[PDB]
């Protein structure tokens, strides 16, 4: 068989693979930036006071 | 007690409420002079510990009552100076167990939102940093907006909502930008 | 329950950039922290609260991130000292 | 019949009446209070800025 099964054209093909592409790099930067923030979030914390910062809160404001 | 208190906090906003329909009025003068104003703005830290049940009803007396002091022009001035901004702070307080946390915010965004529009350009600069000190939050309610037991608790979105709304437009945090 | 995550992932990221802004350079920051919490105090109170099937999970993460956002600016601008 | 079907005494019959007593005064100056705010609020929006007070939000801050 052949000459077309669920398939695409050349024109289309080639924008399906760019908008892949560019999709896949926004996808990429996000997570990076999620897990530079995470990280740099976790080393500011890790110094000290890593559960009282929220138990202040909970004893001061209600439960 | 726990009866006696609630009925004592409660009928001190009846005699407010029928003074001011007799700009002044001698009931609230007498509250200041008395040292009630002072202690009742800082027994307002550590709501949280507090708030059917009978201490949730006697809560809703006592912020009801400042509610009716933000009213009045001369009320500014004396709740003004108890600094209730800061005392409100400390506490951390920013389908039916729901619907009663939103009405602990509405009765708190009342009394800020009436005191605020209540003087004049002495307190809106107080207003503009509870709004960017705690913006974000807000913002989650006006977009929100916009059965029994649901119908109450979307009620109490719409007064929340625009409870701040009307400390934006009096505070002027549109100029702000 | 899609729409809502993104509403939350907004409000995140005004929170970290204030947040991390005032913790920055130091005392000459917190008066304008106090400020925004207390202009804006109650909404605040609802995040902190919620969090004391994909899409589920995505949305209470960002409640939990939302919710330890102020935290920070708390502890950091001393807003407990105000009361 | 009688002598008691799905009935109570009198200690308790006096008890559940100021309980009944007590919970309907609550409501009720609950129900004013709010009444009494809601009236207030009408009288202060009702002088002018109906809808531009939400709409300069709609404007501004995102639909």
Redesign the interface.
Known sequence: SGTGLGEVDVDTYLSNLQTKTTLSMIADGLERSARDFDAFLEENVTLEWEAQRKR??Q????? | DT?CQ?AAM?LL?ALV?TSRASVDCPIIDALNRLNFIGVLVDSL???????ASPSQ?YT??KL?LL?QLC?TRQGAKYVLQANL??????????VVALER??A???A???V?GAAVTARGAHNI???????????????????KN?ILAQQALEERIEE?AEA??????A?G??EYE
Chains 1, 4 share one sequence.
Request: hydrophobic share 50%; no cysteine.
């Open positions: 202040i809160y004893h001061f404001g209600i439960k | 009866t609630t409660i906003n409420h830290k550590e709501i949280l510990n507090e708030w009803q809703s007396a009801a509610l009213q901004f800061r005392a409100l702070e400390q506490s951390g307080v920013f946390h939103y602990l915010l509405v708190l965004a009342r800020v600069v107080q207003g503009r940093k509870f709004l960017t000190q705690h913006r974000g939050l807000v913002v989650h309610v006006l977009k916009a929340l701040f709304m009307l400390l934006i437009t505070t945090f549109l």
